[PDB]
């Protein structure tokens, strides 16, 4: 499923990502745009053999099992295929585990590069939330 910006903002709010662990809603919409262009089925293979999955490009070396990744750790205890659903439930749940570490949203390169230090709330303006 490919989300619109405000459609995803509304879905992320329903999934409890407004103000989760100190991060406002816009952070998550901004992250999704630059990671996956709002596409739940996005995949990206890395040189190291790991793959990024879903709307937030969550990596198989650390977070999910894809059966293909060398020193994979499966911290979210989920098949990576679950992160591809049009239902964003699993991506959100795994994102919340990731962000509950002291690294916070710094786990996502696209977020550090494109979102951190910007007016993130701009990502949720114009939306009937």
């Amino acid at each position: 499923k490919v989300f619109g910006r405000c459609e995803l903002a509304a879905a992320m709010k329903r999934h409890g990502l407004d103000n989760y662990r100190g991060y406002s809603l816009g952070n998550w919409v901004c992250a999704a745009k630059f990671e996956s262009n709002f596409n739940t089925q996005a995949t990206n293979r890395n040189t190291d053999g790991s793959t990024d999955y879903g709307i937030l490009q969550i990596n198989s070396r650390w977070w999910c099992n894809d059966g293909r990744t060398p020193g994979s750790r499966n911290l979210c205890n989920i098949p990576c295929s679950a992160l591809l659903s049009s239902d964003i439930t699993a991506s959100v749940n795994c994102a919340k585990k990731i962000v509950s570490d002291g690294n916070g949203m710094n786990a996502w390169v696209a977020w550090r590069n494109r979102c951190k230090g910007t007016d993130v709330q701009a990502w949720i303006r114009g939306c009937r939330l």
Partner: single-chain antibody
Amino acid sequence: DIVLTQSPATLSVTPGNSVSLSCRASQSIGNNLHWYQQKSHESPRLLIKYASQSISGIPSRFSGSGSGTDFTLSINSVETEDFGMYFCQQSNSWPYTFGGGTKLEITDIQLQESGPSLVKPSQTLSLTCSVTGDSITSDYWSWIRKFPGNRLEYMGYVSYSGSTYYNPSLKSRISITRDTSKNQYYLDLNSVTTEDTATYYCANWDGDYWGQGTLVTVSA
């Protein structure tokens, strides 16, 4: 801190009847409200996560609803096995906090706590959790305690970077550490008082795997 208020405090019900347990929050927490069942001194069992999401192996009769500040656990036709305490827990904001509980009256990986059963005021309490079945580097790890009047307190957790989160109520007396080579992680609580008399639990941060709990009594 987020205060979670549960009502009713106690409920009596006949099997086959349905019940609704309410949890309200002092501030908005989105969908970040989880439900536990706890039976007279065993570890809590996670029933519903994120307000409405089903947990594998949990019976169909349990369902959750709500959002923001208002939440409900529903039991669609209660069975005798459903007796126990029911606790809500929020995960929106550190520190995680539990509701006060509702007494319902009806008319792979393993964790093992070890430590002293009796400690003296002002000594250090040291606990070990031994993890079987997976490496400790593959999850986040928590400590939780239950005070004698059924009150639950989330003490802390350590995550993948080694960053720790401690309940501020513990005022810097707590330390959580790991030993990868031993597959153990630890709780140290300094300068204990009789206020630290509790049953202590280790658990993974996900709330799926719990130790059995260990009662520690602080006495002169």
